[PDB]
Assembly symmetry: D3
Homo-oligomer: 175 residues x 6
């Protein structure tokens, strides 16, 4: 099932990301249930906004906010919910919210899946417009939700992203 | 697995519905197989009709017609086949066909998912139009099938829908 | 799980196909992982081409290329990745590629799902345009992938398709 | 503009149909305004039904119901509203409603646009299932509309369809 | 042409809105060009936001900001760019930006198109959620543009929306 | 009408492209009719291929094949048939077919519509995958159409594209 997908073939450089929410989709926040491994609806978003990239997580990790590391994955076409994509991390958006530090990594499709992203090696290589749209989405998508708040802190590089992956894999194995 | 989802967190007021067919989708009737948990195509509908709401069932229940309780769930955007939604029952369409009594519950998204449906408490709070569209769909969607027949008896209120969930949950323990 | 779907209710005339790629979809090649049962992204296709029918495999078979038998299934509307369809084989497109025989079966929805395909009994009953489109898709969709190539050899009849199903079932059963 | 499209290159065998409503679309009835030539919304349908084929009309015709001849056009993929498709008539569904005799012709794409339909020469050549779904749609799509009623009378052949085209072209030119 | 559509059949209670951007669509801002009547791309939006309702204007009007009156129209399914819908005004969101006063009217489909919106007579009958989503969209959709700024002032009632339509219709006569 | 859209605000650097076929759409080839200005269906393509970018033409130009200059325009989301986009030429794919030279320009959205394409100044700035996909599409999409064929000759730079625009404008102006 989805509960037994590996964190990656070779962490933290070569990872698997379990997709929860397709890029450019309707505003429904899905999450994979840790118990059943099924796709649950978490929320129908109240702002008229959509996740800008496919969104999911790395299995067998535990971040500082209490859940698996969250990852955004840009692709040429949107992926299915519940699919597993091989990726390489290039960057991270740091932000805090009610859950604690809730970082969003960015990882692009591995060169075996496509050579389209081979030229993206670090956070400075992502399009400026994509980075701005991602930050603006996390700054505002919860603006109409009652008990919730976000502060976006800013972008860090691929080395920062990989260290969060190592740390969160270490934390799950112990914890 | 989808076979391991709970009936609900606090039945019968707070339930989980496993979605089989999205609202406003192509006329493919899917059903979750009890053996595998996999989504099986049951039928390509011959009428040019679509389910007016998302359609699914409550896991770990056994209605009078031999299957899990069937539920319609209105949402602001259509859900994925195989996803699980937390809901509150608000009424039931009673109908008979060749499985016997084949009532269709209506449940709305739980207030944790959306504020949109908080003001819907009972069957008289559903829009008249949506009730008429649901009854008309179930009256006509198997018109070009066989020896199927449907007789719609009418709407009952939330207290009756809750009785059907408890009876069918307690029923399935036993069998 | 998808892993425990049967090959068929009555091989070789009545089989189950596990769908990986919907008809007329974006050009993403999904595969079901044999260990986890999850949907993995295999490749983002570089050609501007789409599978002309839903594409999947018969579980618990082992074909001459080392993988379950591959099957195309025409339907009136596209199926979800991960779904299972009951089908009847009508024909096979023999082709070789870069490690070996890699035939593609064609199978139509079973008469219990729809009467639409009842008149298609054999490969001569498939529309000619459809067969030309399938063979053109397989001839060209890996054209931009450097180490890959495809030789299409031609269409054979349902008797040939059914022989392959039984032989491939026995190969998996006995290994 | 759309107001100056010809009825056809060679009536009644070779016609143009102006598409108003795409096949397999949401339940919105559009109509081309005779004054402005713009696409107007005529109705949001209240049943959960969808037109089974692309729907439109032949320009410069005037049927017995007071409007241009209505035509259904099956295609491999849905057409855009406001597009013009070259067709050959193969059949007609006769029905009466509040407007009078309101026949719905069926015409398939001309062989210059595709050879897919070249084998459809008359009403008996259309799939049985398509004809049944078309009749059932016109029998029921107005069931929830207040001041409206339909009686479906039945199918007639291509010669009947072409005579309605000749008659309605004659009636417009005079009237 | 779309340039020849009337402002309305009985202004200001009964109007026509020409639709430019569908509800819940990709973030392409279209506008009808006054010269040609053609649909022109005005902008690819940089935010990951979508218009929460269909968006368009009333033809043959001239508001204080130099353009036709702008109108949001909620519908049960999204409309086509360039289509024309008969509506009734129910309120107005007052806001200023760099065109000056750039109010956005809300109008619902006329009762001849749908019974769904009959019970909405004035601005307090719109769902609170939908009003909040509209205000939040207009507050944030140009966040990543330039020297644009928006200040939302608040909702006024149907009597004020009707005054703005008459003033702008009578205005455009003159100029 | 579409017929009176200008070639450009400042040829050849700043042009308007009238879109006929959206990116990533079903395989229907639309063309704008030069007499009526309507969208006509030209062909249902028999290959399982899609245009890899939006496709259209510059109005009031006359290229060496007797038709307005053809243009592909990459956008972040697909455009509506019949829409007009302001663009800047970056390159041209020279090709011959069965009556003559039939070059295809590539032009990107103008910086007033989006900053995304500002860094694409010339043909060497287009992603290599994209150029390979375009050339592969034009090499193969008429493969099943008996009297048609295509020889791709290669990519030339923006200076070559702009020469063709001006020459083709002068040809239409002077004929
Ligand atoms: Mg969207
Ligand atoms: Mg997460
Ligand atoms: Mg987190
Ligand atoms: Mg059921
Ligand atoms: Mg039941
Ligand atoms: Mg496609
Ligand atoms: Mg194989
Ligand atoms: Mg539909
Ligand atoms: Mg008509
Ligand atoms: Mg009529
Ligand atoms: Mg405006
Ligand atoms: Mg304005
Ligand atoms: Mg040309």
């Amino acid at each position: 099932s989805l509960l037994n997908v590996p964190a990656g073939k070779d962490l933290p450089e070569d990872i698997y990301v379990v997709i929860e929410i397709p890029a450019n989709a309707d505003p429904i926040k899905y999450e994979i249930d840790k118990e059943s491994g099924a796709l649950f609806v978490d929320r129908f978003m109240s702002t008229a906004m959509f996740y800008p990239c496919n969104y999911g997580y790395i299995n067998h990790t535990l971040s500082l906010d209490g859940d698996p590391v969250d990852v955004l994955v840009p692709t040429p076409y949107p992926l299915q919910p519940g699919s597993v994509t091989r990726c390489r991390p290039v960057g991270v958006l740091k932000m805090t919210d009610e859950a604690g530090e809730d970082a969003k990594l960015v990882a692009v499709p591995h060169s075996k899946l496509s050579k389209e992203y081979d030229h993206i090696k670090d956070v400075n290589d992502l399009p400026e417009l994509l980075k701005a749209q991602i930050a603006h989405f996390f700054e505002h998508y919860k603006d109409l939700e009652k008990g919730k708040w976000v502060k976006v802190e800013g972008w860090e590089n691929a080395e920062a992203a990989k260290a969060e992956i190592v740390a969160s894999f270490e934390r799950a194995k112990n914890k």
